[PDB]
Write an enzyme that holds these catalytic residues in place. Structure first.
Site, mmCIF file in Angstrom:
data_model
loop_
_atom_site.group_PDB
_atom_site.id
_atom_site.type_symbol
_atom_site.label_atom_id
_atom_site.label_comp_id
_atom_site.label_asym_id
_atom_site.label_seq_id
_atom_site.Cartn_x
_atom_site.Cartn_y
_atom_site.Cartn_z
ATOM 1 N N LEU A 149 0.843 -1.097 0.150
ATOM 2 C CA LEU A 149 0.021 0.193 0.102
ATOM 3 C C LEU A 149 1.002 1.152 0.132
ATOM 4 O O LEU A 149 2.105 1.260 0.227
ATOM 5 N N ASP A 150 0.345 2.367 -0.077
ATOM 6 C CA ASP A 150 0.870 3.589 -0.257
ATOM 7 C C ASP A 150 0.802 4.140 1.313
ATOM 8 O O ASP A 150 0.469 3.667 2.188
#
Length: 278
Positions: free
Chosen positions: A104-105
């Site tokens: 994920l970011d």
RNA sequence: GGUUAAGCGACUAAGCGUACACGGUGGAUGCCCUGGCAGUCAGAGGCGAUGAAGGACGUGCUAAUCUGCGAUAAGCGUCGGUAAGGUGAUAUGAACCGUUAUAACCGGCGAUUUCCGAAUGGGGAAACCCAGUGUGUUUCGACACACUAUCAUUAACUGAAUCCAUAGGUUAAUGAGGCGAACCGGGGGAACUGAAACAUCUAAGUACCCCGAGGAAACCGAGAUUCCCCCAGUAGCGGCGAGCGAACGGGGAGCAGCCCAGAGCCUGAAUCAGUGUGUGUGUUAGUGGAAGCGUCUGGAAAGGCGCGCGAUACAGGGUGACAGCCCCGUACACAAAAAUGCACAUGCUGUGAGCUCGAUGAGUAGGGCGGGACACGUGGUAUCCUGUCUGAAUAUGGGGGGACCAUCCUCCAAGGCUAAAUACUCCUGACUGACCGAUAGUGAACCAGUACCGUGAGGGAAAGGCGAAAAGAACCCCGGCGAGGGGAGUGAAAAAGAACCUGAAACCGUGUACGUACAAGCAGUGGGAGCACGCUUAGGCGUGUGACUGCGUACCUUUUGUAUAAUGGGUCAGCGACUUAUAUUCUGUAGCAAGGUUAACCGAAUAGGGGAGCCGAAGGGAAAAGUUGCAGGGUAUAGACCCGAAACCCGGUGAUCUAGCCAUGGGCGACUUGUGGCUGGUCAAACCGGGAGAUAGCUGGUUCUCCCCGAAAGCUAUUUAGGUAGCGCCUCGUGAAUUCGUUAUCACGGGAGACACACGGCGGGGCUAACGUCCGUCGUGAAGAGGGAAACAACCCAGACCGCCAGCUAAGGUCCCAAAGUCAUGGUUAAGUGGGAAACGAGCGGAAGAUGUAACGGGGCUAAACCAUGCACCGAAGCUGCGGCAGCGACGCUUAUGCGUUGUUGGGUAGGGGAGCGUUCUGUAAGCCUGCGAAGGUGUGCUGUGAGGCAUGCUGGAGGUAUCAGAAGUGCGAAUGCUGACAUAAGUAACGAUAAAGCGGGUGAAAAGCCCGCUCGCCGGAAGACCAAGGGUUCCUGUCCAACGUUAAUCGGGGCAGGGUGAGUCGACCCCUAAGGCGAGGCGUAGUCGAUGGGAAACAGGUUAAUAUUCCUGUACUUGGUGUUACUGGUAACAUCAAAUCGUACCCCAAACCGACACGGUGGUCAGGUAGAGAAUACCAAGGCGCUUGAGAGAACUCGCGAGACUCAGUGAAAUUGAACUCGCUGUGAGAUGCAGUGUACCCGCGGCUGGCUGUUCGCCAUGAACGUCGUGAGACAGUUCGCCGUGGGCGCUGGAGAACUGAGGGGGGCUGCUCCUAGUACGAGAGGACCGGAGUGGACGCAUCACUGGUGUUCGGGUUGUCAUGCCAAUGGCACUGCCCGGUAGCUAAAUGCGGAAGAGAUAAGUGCCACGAAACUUGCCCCGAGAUGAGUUCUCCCUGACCCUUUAAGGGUCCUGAAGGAACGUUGAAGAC
């Protein structure tokens, strides 16, 4: 059976693959006395004697937990700038470690799963399984019921016709709404790229339910929940691998609610810990 | 005495925990056993074409099995020993035979002695099917007996190519193609362990397998052979690495040395063998065979007391308890109808001696050409084997004498034989033991080569403790004509009654006593109070229970640490990983004193006799006066402290099933079916057995108890790496000089393990720049007790052997918790300083920071703190005092420890040294103990500083033990150990590959579900029936309900009994033919064989309780023999007689069969009537029958008032977890449910524990740097975001019950906006512009809302296509989702109307004055809740007269009698409405 040398030293509590190759090239750890060559394979048998740079390490149960990753963290380990990550709250294991599943970011929250085996962490990512998961989208902008049916069909994104499946409405009359979008293909960040075409900017993406694991109603950010035996056996036989009968979780159903409360207390405690590390 | 108030104070457990007594599931231990492993002294090593071993049926007076037996079928003939009994055993009864000599059992001699299996006439499936040829025959149509698949040898006879010879065919005789161990020989042939490295080598001419044979195999001398005992772990050989490996002599003779080349004078000779008879001596079946009479105790006597016999015989076991003499076996004395073995009379056939006259072994050696095996690639190369083509000699040639050349003697090539002992133990009889006694020993002690599993093969469990004798319950009562249990009777004993001698631990119950409902989270001992059954002529003496207090971060394995979110075991019982055999070395013990020792063999079988070896006896000298066994302690080597490795090699299964190709036979076009052939990188070299009980040094694991002592951290030399030389200090033994008052030091011998360091003060070392990095002993945070800092083993303190209600220190400290100055004398007395640090400015503010207080372990503390000086108490297990300073080591008094004292005292893994027990077997020991009650098991008490032993009681009723020794399968808390017996989880989850339940009647003690009956609709060209497989009595009837079946189950697809299924015209066997096979010679022809078509017939109906097309009845057709007639043996007509075996039911499209829930696969045959073009659709026809189980309620979601889910009768689980009386937060140590301190609990449940948030990317509020795939550094795959707070029953608040109040503490009652008047305003020379108070109008529902205004609405207005009800239609109602619904009243639900949170008053911070003001979080007070608030109140009406005895005469209990007010109750109740 014979296996790779860089894979045995991966889950034993050292590094991964490229980091192990940087150690065997200097003449540190060696198998059967002689210096092993890169790109070979040996038969792992409970009887070998190796010293990790002159240190005897005993190398011979799978545990999968659910951590939820808030904002301001990274899914990796090392960082050139020094930003906090997610591998700072996991407990220590004797000859084992944790393997993250997914990526994920910074502005994308989710309930990541940390397993111990490297083979199961590569099966849920492959599109051969196709597991449906639940997400919570908090929109903020101009959006009506006319654009909810246009994005469900073939819409050109930038690489492939990314679309959604089912979009429902579960309240939202104040400043934001609730557009629970159900996905099942996976990929990486496929919700923000579709809502930015209009007034929606996607302020935060929070994952609710993943597959069929029941989400504990009452779990704040900053904390991992170790899945019991009845929950880890579902994703084991879902691909190929037989279910394991050896575990550690017993009953502690009231001890587990004790867990819930004291752990909300200790997530407050870990927020304090992150503040201190600052 | 009565009333009121206050403090203390008996009495509430549907549970859990502890102790004694009384049971059960479970059957351990002790004891017992016609069954084994392993040896010695006689023997045996068989059977093998007159029918084997291993194996189905049949056989008895009888229902069956195993052994045995074969229609002459555990019985019969002949010949022998005993005639007072028998028809095998499991396992009894019923039925017979024998008695002045025809019973049964044992031995020998005959006849007789199935199908099938090496099986021979041809196939084949070990028990399916047909016999071919040649005689006799009271049966020309029926049976039995005999002979014939081959090869080889001898004799006779016959015969081709091809005149002779030879191949083939016939007859007779002899010999044998069989299977299962060990050992030996011949022909072939492996892997794994340690190998410095490597196809050198050892292991290993091995394990295993094939053919055949045998009884066992093959310079001092001397010419059958082999094995055992020696030379000898030798002389040699090898990178002289580990290994492998000879002979003569001698010590021991349990050896016996033959025949042929032989002519001639002389033969039935001497020495012997084979085949018969007779005598004598043996082996293999039998009989006779002496010797204890009685009494006491006990139901019963094998033992005890007194008196005897016997003893060539007491070897053992059984005979009511431990037996010489009550029985069965042993000395002594006898028999021979058959067979066999070792000396001797006679007879027939016999390869044959002595004397004389001769001889002592020719296709060979050597040489030449072409190959292979002998370790050696054709080498410097010896020896062994020599196809084809060739070829010598007889002292003129060869070998040997522990091998140069020489001499003398023997020897110098094709012959034929050679016992026993020694090897080997699958079967019989006798005998033996410091082996074992049902988880032992063998897979198997009985019906174990078992049930069961797999295609075959390989591999592979549990189960007797019957009693002395079965005396194994007549009758009666309850119940279901049962099971089970209680009486009586029998017996010495009945909690031993078909689970059957004795019956443990763990798990699960009853009765009594004690504790718990305010208790502190793996708490046990100790101190203390109360109470109970037996102290006891006052004596809180002991045990179990035992409110409350104090002390203490559980235990084991794995570790640099284990109190840890890091890991391991559920417990009990039984069982379990030998230090042996074979060399060398070292130590200890004991006999002749300058002969210390023999092994095998032999022996009156351990002594005697025997010295060929090993270990020693000539030191001093570089060189030229003691030993063998046993036992104990180490290393290496057959496995050797090794639980399941993996991989590879070898010996028996490898085109069977699925999926294809060439050539196809039939039935109706890329159809389907059957057979055969071709193609092995997953049936493409799976598993098991043998090697192998192999093998990975670490990981798991070096096991019971016990006394003393006890090596290391980051290191040194420094290469070549998980290693070779080597470690000061320390241990046992010896040596031991003041060397550094019992050797602290030096040397020698034995045993042969670890290794990431970190912090602070002082003293040293990159920019003491980094609070890092780099150095030393005891010593707080990690192989040293306890105390102290809140707790522990990297600075504090202390060497902790044992007992006690003793006193005195140091460190840390002295307010309470909790035993330690509320001290004394000088300072300090308003910054929560005492409860961290740097720099800058002048002892203060001191990055001076949220350790429940706006930062001590707890409550506190404004000096109750800190520094200095002086004076006390408290302070461990140290010092001291008492007792053995229990135990060990010295000196001074002493010759086999009675010391008067002092000192070292239990830190620890590996390793090492001295003193250890219990149990089992033998000699000690046929002795002693031994029914006035053994051992073991189960309690208590006594004794001992070690593990223990001894006594008694209860239960039980049959053989047991100690002292002086020795030999091992030898003391158990874990390896996911193995076997057997058992919990929590839980009396809970679950009721499933989907037609539908309910009502009635009958049987039964009990009918929700089973059986039977009636109507409509779910199944229904197939969820049906009939054939071909598998199965071989699951189908019919009757009885019974333990087991078998997901509940019940009187049913049945279960057990038992009765009852087997009519065949020349039911199906086709035999034979012939095609494709595809086999096929004597040759390397596919002639033949032998092989069908779902062609191959004589019958289509139908009636008759069953179960199965038919057959028998009865009616009709039709064909093929042989015999008799008659007709025509010329054949044909036609009529009549008569004969014609075998095997298969046969139920099941056959999912129930009875194969995967546990048809979590599917599943060949082939028949498409009726009406309608239609067809096989869709339409009458879903007829028949077979209609989920494997119920009753109320009927969310969200899903499918179309129903069908599911959830909660409930009955029945009935797994995984996980060491074990429970499952308490938060802060803090400590790598996220504390369990330790310490504070707040808070009656037991069992349910609901709470980042959208409540943010006006729009940002802020607030705390219920080519990675992480993983695999890949021989070859890169791609896809892939990278880059208990607490609350709510309900049963209880309590001082016997008990039904209400109204006072209201401690918290979320909740204090949260929001606009306009108009006051007001172009207070202040100010203007502009902009107030603050407070009052009224009215808006969000959010604060409780609401029915007069009026809306919506929704399964019992009433009010219709309608068809149908149904009121007799039919209309006029009225109801059903197919509420058929689409069109309107409304009351109760409930609401966007509109009224009221209503910003108050009145008191107390603060910030801010604002000189007491006055003071906000949305706090408080009597404005909604509302609340006495489980254990601190627990008052008032109020009520509720509140039954007695006699026992006893320790008191807050007591029981029996007879009695059942109030109030609460609790569910057949007499659904406009109350999910539950």
């Amino acid at each position: 059976m014979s296996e790779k040398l860089q894979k045995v030293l991966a889950r034993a509590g050292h590094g991964s693959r490229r980091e192990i190759e940087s150690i065997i090239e200097a003449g540190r750890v060696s198998v059967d006395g002689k210096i092993a060559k890169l790109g070979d394979r040996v038969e792992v048998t409970p009887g070998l004697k190796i010293r990790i740079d002159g240190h005897l390490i005993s190398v011979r149960i799978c545990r999968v937990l659910a951590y939820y990753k808030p904002e301001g963290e990274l899914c990796t380990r090392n960082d050139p700038e020094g930003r906090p990550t997610v591998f700072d709250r996991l407990p220590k294991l004797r000859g084992a470690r944790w393997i993250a599943v997914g990526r994920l970011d910074v502005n994308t929250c989710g309930l990541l799963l940390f397993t111990t085996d490297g083979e199961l962490a590569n099966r849920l990512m492959h599109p051969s399984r196709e597991v449906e998961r639940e997400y919570a989208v908090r929109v903020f902008g101009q959006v009506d019921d006319a654009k909810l049916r246009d994005l469900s069909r073939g819409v050109q994104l930038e690489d492939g016709p990314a679309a959604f499946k089912t979009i429902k409405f579960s309240g939202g009359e104040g400043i934001n709404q609730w557009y629970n979008v159900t996905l099942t293909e996976g990929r990486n960040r496929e919700v923000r790229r579709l809502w930015e075409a209009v007034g929606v900017q996607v302020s935060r993406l929070i994952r609710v339910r993943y597959g069929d694991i029941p989400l504990p109603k009452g779990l704040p950010r900053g904390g991992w929940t170790e899945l019991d035996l009845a929950q880890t056996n579902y994703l084991r036989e879902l691909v190929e691998l037989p279910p394991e009968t050896s575990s550690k979780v017993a009953v502690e159903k009231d001890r587990r609610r004790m867990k819930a409360n004291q752990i909300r207390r200790a997530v407050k405690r870990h927020s304090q810990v992150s503040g201190g590390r600052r």
